[PDB]
Amino acid sequence: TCPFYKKIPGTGFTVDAFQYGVVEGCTAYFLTHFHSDHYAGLSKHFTFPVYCSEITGNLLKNKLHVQEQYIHPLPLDTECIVNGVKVVLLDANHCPGAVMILFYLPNGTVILHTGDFRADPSMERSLLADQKVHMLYLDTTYCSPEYTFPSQQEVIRFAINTAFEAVTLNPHALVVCGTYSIGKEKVFLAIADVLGSKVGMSQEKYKTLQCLNIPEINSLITTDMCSSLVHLLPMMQINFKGLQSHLKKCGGKYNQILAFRPTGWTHSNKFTRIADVIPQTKGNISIYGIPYSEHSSYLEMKRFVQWLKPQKIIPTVNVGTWKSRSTMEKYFREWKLEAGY
Ligand code: NI
């Protein structure tokens, strides 16, 4: 059964609630983004209205074969009416197509559901600036002060500089980047741009990327692995055994691998600066873990909430343990006392 924090009171709506069967009272199912923990349950046999972004609806139709008549894509930054209720979709700064949803309830209550997001000051100048928000359904993934990480721009600077140096020293080095979901495309696109290469990948991953409205994409990606010196592999293959095996398949074209695993946070964040990150090495294989996050750090999350000043916060992540819930509630109260709302 569907948990309360996936239900929008005073509507017939749910958010990211496709794994519970037919939800009683639900007239419209919203999907914030195409990540499996959130779409779990959708397929060609789904026959209720799904509301989402254009990019998300391309993925639903092409990857999961949801029939077109049930996909309701909405433009961003535009007031729309769904089953009698005004809604707006806003960019979540998460993966491609990911949205936050503003609901304007018939009784005057305003609710923001962030989906998954990486808070940014640029959100302080969207349509959120224009009215009060009463209830916030918040992505609390990294809601603890230990979770610090660098800007996405610092991380990509590190990656491009690392790759360009390695391949200029050894033109027979191959670069490999791990992936298992959409998101974090900048990692492999920025490294291929500095090297003058396309990114090579499986037909299944190429298909996924072609749903994303990324500009000039036919110019940056390919299924012809032989023509590319940046390859994408599944995340599970980014280890010494998997990479040794891949290097064998390349037929003596290459004699070294430099590989990147874009994780979110790891405890090497609490001690070490990005500039100071070093790889794990075995023979002619090196593996870099880089802290490229598509979720808010603690400080970014606190700044957003202290700006928005909601009356009530409902966490949507880390809600399964009493210790996690009590921790999060204590920071919410600190934030409110410090800012004065
Ligand atoms: Ni996500």
Side-chain angles (χ1 to χ4, degrees), residues 1-23 25-203 205-215 217-240 242-247 249-269 271-281 283-311 313-341:
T1 71
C2 182
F4 72 102
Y5 65 81
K6 299 182 174 272
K7 293 179 188 179
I8 305 299
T11 70
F13 304 154
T14 59
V15 177
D16 305 342
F18 301 89
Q19 59 169 295
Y20 302 107
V22 181
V23 176
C26 190
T27 60
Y29 295 72
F30 286 79
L31 182 58
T32 64
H33 68 292
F34 198 77
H35 279 162
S36 66
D37 276 359
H38 300 256
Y39 68 70
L42 278 157
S43 80
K44 68 169 72 172
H45 310 292
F46 201 83
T47 53
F48 294 95
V50 178
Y51 290 87
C52 60
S53 66
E54 171 186 358
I55 286 162
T56 299
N58 300 338
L59 293 158
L60 289 183
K61 173 189 169 173
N62 290 290
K63 304 286 298 188
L64 306 177
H65 313 291
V66 177
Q67 301 166 46
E68 201 138 67
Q69 76 177 117
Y70 302 117
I71 307 165
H72 300 260
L74 308 173
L76 301 186
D77 297 323
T78 301
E79 297 181 323
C80 297
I81 305 309
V82 175
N83 293 1
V85 180
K86 182 161 66 168
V87 308
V88 173
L89 303 190
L90 311 162
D91 205 275
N93 188 44
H94 185 52
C95 67
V99 302
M100 312 190 293
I101 310 160
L102 251 196
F103 300 95
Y104 293 79
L105 264 48
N107 75 359
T109 300
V110 179
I111 296 172
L112 177 61
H113 194 303
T114 67
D116 282 346
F117 86 140
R118 183 163 185 177
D120 192 75
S122 63
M123 296 171 173
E124 301 166 17
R125 296 170 279 283
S126 62
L127 307 195
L128 285 176
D130 310 36
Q131 75 296 280
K132 190 188 174 55
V133 172
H134 306 81
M135 315 177 67
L136 180 63
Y137 287 65
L138 181 59
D139 168 12
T140 47
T141 296
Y142 292 126
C143 187
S144 194
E146 71 270 29
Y147 302 113
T148 62
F149 30 66
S151 62
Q152 294 177 166
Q153 189 271 333
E154 296 170 75
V155 178
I156 286 304
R157 182 98 271 218
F158 175 83
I160 288 164
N161 287 357
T162 301
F164 183 77
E165 178 186 304
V167 176
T168 299
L169 292 171
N170 181 193
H172 298 271
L174 174 66
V175 178
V176 180
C177 297
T179 190
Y180 43 32
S181 57
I182 65 168
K184 309 186 183 183
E185 290 77 12
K186 191 66 173 175
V187 180
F188 49 89
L189 298 173
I191 287 169
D193 175 77
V194 81
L195 298 174
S197 181
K198 301 193 176 181
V199 186
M201 61 194 67
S202 71
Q203 302 179 247
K205 184 77 185 180
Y206 184 87
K207 179 182 185 182
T208 301
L209 298 182
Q210 290 291 161
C211 298
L212 309 181
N213 293 349
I214 285 172
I217 202 62
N218 297 330
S219 63
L220 330 157
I221 60 171
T222 189
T223 54
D224 180 0
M225 314 292 284
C226 294
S227 73
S228 159
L229 55 148
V230 180
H231 296 176
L232 301 192
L233 292 182
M235 202 72 90
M236 292 187 74
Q237 194 163 5
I238 311 307
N239 52 71
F240 296 120
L243 292 167
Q244 271 161 223
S245 176
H246 188 69
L247 188 58
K249 293 166 215 136
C250 294
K253 202 158 196 299
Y254 308 108
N255 66 358
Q256 181 185 346
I257 283 174
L258 178 107
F260 294 92
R261 294 185 345 84
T263 66
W265 174 90
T266 53
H267 193 58
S268 15
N269 274 281
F271 310 129
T272 308
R273 285 171 145 68
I274 182 64
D276 301 315
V277 169
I278 59 168
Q280 289 196 229
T281 298
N284 58 344
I285 306 180
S286 299
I287 308 175
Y288 285 89
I290 60 173
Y292 191 94
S293 185
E294 291 186 340
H295 295 274
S296 313
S297 70
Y298 174 87
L299 290 169
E300 291 160 353
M301 189 189 302
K302 176 178 185 280
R303 177 186 165 111
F304 180 78
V305 173
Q306 291 181 312
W307 168 86
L308 190 73
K309 302 181 172 56
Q311 300 176 351
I313 306 172
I314 302 164
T316 63
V317 188
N318 305 308
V319 299
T321 80
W322 303 112
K323 183 167 156 229
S324 290
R325 282 193 160 287
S326 170
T327 295
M328 292 182 295
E329 284 172 7
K330 289 176 30 265
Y331 293 124
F332 308 146
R333 184 60 63 191
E334 291 177 15
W335 302 350
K336 177 177 169 88
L337 291 169
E338 183 194 21
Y341 51 102

